[PDB]
């Protein structure tokens, strides 16, 4: 769906998921947003479900921003293989999400509409989130 | 690259080895190298 055009390396180590976030913690493009509270990998193929849901529930009367982006690839092996003999082939693109990271943002919308929309996004995302508003 | 010996021209010795080319320098070379047996700088060929 969304993914890097090029990458210098097609097979990579996997990223640490222990820790807290190092950015994206403040709603800056929009008015509202969705702040993760659990660590996970969020994949392109499910960002393209969350975005669909948010886009349609707002009836095309608002504005969505996606802050995270899938940079890293993960590789998997074929169906019935033993261990060893190389590293598997690329399977998808992920993004590691840690507590604090705003996932989506919205604007041009009322508070109740955005509440229900970002509710209806986080049922397709493997992380527990909370609705967050722009800060002080 | 071809590998050549440098016999001297007064002292008959063969006391250096070098690396010439067979197209870029395709002609028997000369050198002013130290002939040890004569204790001198002297002309070397081959």
């Amino acid at each position: 769906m969304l993914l890097p055009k090029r990458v210098k390396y097609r097979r990579q180590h996997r990223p640490k998921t222990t820790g807290r976030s190092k950015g994206g913690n403040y709603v800056t493009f929009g008015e509202f947003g969705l702040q993760a509270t659990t660590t996970s990998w969020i994949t392109s193929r499910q960002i393209e479900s969350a975005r669909i849901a948010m886009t349609r529930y707002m009836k095309r009367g608002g504005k969505v921003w996606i802050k995270i982006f899938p940079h890293t690839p993960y590789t998997k092996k074929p169906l019935e293989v033993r261990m060893g003999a190389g590293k598997g082939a690329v399977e998808g693109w992920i993004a590691v999400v840690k507590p604090g990271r705003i996932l989506f943002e919205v604007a041009g919308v009322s508070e109740e509409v955005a509440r229900e929309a970002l509710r209806l996004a986080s049922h397709k995302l493997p992380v527990k989130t909370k609705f967050v508003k722009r800060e002080e | 690259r071809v590998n050549v010996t440098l016999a001297c021209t007064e002292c008959g010795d063969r006391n250096y080895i070098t690396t010439k080319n067979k197209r870029n320098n395709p002609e028997r070379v000369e050198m002013k190298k130290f002939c040890s047996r004569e204790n001198k700088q002297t002309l070397h060929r081959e």
Binding site: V81, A85, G86, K87 | -
Partner: protein, 77 residues
Amino acid sequence: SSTKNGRDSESKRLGAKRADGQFVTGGSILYRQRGTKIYPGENVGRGGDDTLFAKIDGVVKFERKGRDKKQVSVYAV
């Protein structure tokens, strides 16, 4: 399913060989390196491969050369 990786070099033990404030004998090696990560100071010299050796048996002290560079000088004991 075979791969075309699996080969590395041989690690060449490459780094500081005497400590700041140690007494060195006048031919010891003081730092090995690829290209000048540290420069030759006073009484010190660099050879082919850029390895830093002390010419005279004194003390070795690592110093600063400007804002970025560095240097290995050998005072007299």
